[PDB]
């Protein structure tokens, strides 16, 4: 209720050039060149039309992508307010390509059987299946990658909410893909943050952020009567937090797939790295920290940049959220801006 130091609040509690712009330009006439010498329902309708008034009186920090998919893989309801959705593209190549780009000594028939088998396990018509969730990868590779039961706690989450078959079928696909030189990347690009699903039966319409900040979305305590919002890594198993040594800078968020090429029999590792390095410096630090280079070709990891967390500090690690009965180390990331980035792995 008013301050002592007035000048700082008129700007805080709250153009004239555009007013002056039309003033010389538009106010001026015939220039240029010169010559010498109905209680509630009614209220609602009126407001919708009016809303079209204000929004049509004017006119960028947000982008929404929207898509319809099935609930076979993925599943919006199990997931929450802040979640990574990864797209999956063109099931048509049941290893059709396996024919090529597959080195000899490879039974390229593995994918077609692994994958077609996946379909039997879980036709084309009304919709297609895209949108793999971040969650569903953590469980599929849970037993594959390094930490178990912090990792398997995520697997308990998906079997009880999202089927262990599909996880196992999809894991067989990841093994078969990493086998034949068709990788999980060059598939599964980043899609968004999962604003609102709107599902019906086996169908889902998923809105999610193409890019822009997350926290500024549907917001509220939670989006709709669900819970809060966050980009919680979902693993104390994922959220490899680099910058063991660090100085304040905007943390960055990348997506890395680590593989095993007969060292472990086509290992799939999927996690997120959070440190301040611009992609030209991440390839170096990815060379270190990794002994997965086993030739036992030489293409160990492939990474794309999700975006920025233009504040270092929100990196909460919580093994504390329920997506049904199951509990998961959950790391909360406070504030995120999404830069989709591109996939770079040459080596």
């Amino acid at each position: 209720t008013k301050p002592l130091p007035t000048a700082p609040m008129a700007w805080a509690e709250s153009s004239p050039r555009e007013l002056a712009g039309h003033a010389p330009l538009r106010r001026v006439l015939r220039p240029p060149i010169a010559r010498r010498d109905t209680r509630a329902t009614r209220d609602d309708t009126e407001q919708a039309v009016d809303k079209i008034l204000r929004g049509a009186r004017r006119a960028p920090r947000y982008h929404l992508t929207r898509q319809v998919t099935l609930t076979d893989l993925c599943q919006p309801n199990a997931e929450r307010a802040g979640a990574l959705l990864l797209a999956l593209r063109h099931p048509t190549d049941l290893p059709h390509l396996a024919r090529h780009r597959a080195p000899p000594g490879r039974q390229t028939e593995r994918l077609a059987e692994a994958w077609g088998q996946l379909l039997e396990a879980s036709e084309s018509g009304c919709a297609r299946a895209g949108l793999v969730s971040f969650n569903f990868l953590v469980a599929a590779c849970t037993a594959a990658y390094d930490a178990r039961d912090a990792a398997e706690a995520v697997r308990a989450h998906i079997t009880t909410n999202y089927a262990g078959a599909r996880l196992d079928r999809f894991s067989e696909c990841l093994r078969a893909m990493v086998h034949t030189h068709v990788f999980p990347h060059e598939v599964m690009r980043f899609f968004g943050g999962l604003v609102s699903w709107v599902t019906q039966d086996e169908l889902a319409s998923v809105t999610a952020v193409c890019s822009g900040p997350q926290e500024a979305t549907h917001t509220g305590h939670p989006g709709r009567p669900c819970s809060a919002v966050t980009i919680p890594a979902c693993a104390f198993v994922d959220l490899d937090a680099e910058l063991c040594l660090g100085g304040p800078g905007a943390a960055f968020l990348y997506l890395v797939f680590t593989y095993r090429q007969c060292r472990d029999q086509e290992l799939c590792c999927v996690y997120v790295v959070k440190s301040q390095l611009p992609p030209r410096g991440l390839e170096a630090a990815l060379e270190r920290l990794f002994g997965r280079l086993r030739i036992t070709t030489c293409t160990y990891a492939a990474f794309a940049e999700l975006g920025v967390m233009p504040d270092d500090s929100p990196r909460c690690l919580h093994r504390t959220e329920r997506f049904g009965a199951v509990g998961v180390p959950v790391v909360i990331l406070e504030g995120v801006v999404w830069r989709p980035g591109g996939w770079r792995a040459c080596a």
Binding site: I52, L64, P91, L94, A112, E113, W115, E123, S124
Partner: protein
Amino acid sequence: ARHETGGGVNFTLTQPRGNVDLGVGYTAVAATATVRNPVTDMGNLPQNFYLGRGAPPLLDNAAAVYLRNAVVAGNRLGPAQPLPVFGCAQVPRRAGMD
């Protein structure tokens, strides 16, 4: 809600709605009263098992493929080309239907 689309700006209106059946028993009943048409020719098309694969084949590979194309020869739904592991089994499409 407004979202900018290709060569335009798009307003989507939505309305939240919810409903309960007020009745403790059965309050609506439906009666079929007549048939417009059959929507299906009510005819003879067989099943062709060579469209799917659940079944291990004959072990003579000549007896196996001599077999398949003797059945698949003219089928009304015979497969179109050798079964791709993906896509669809591809029933052909005839040029007219009645």
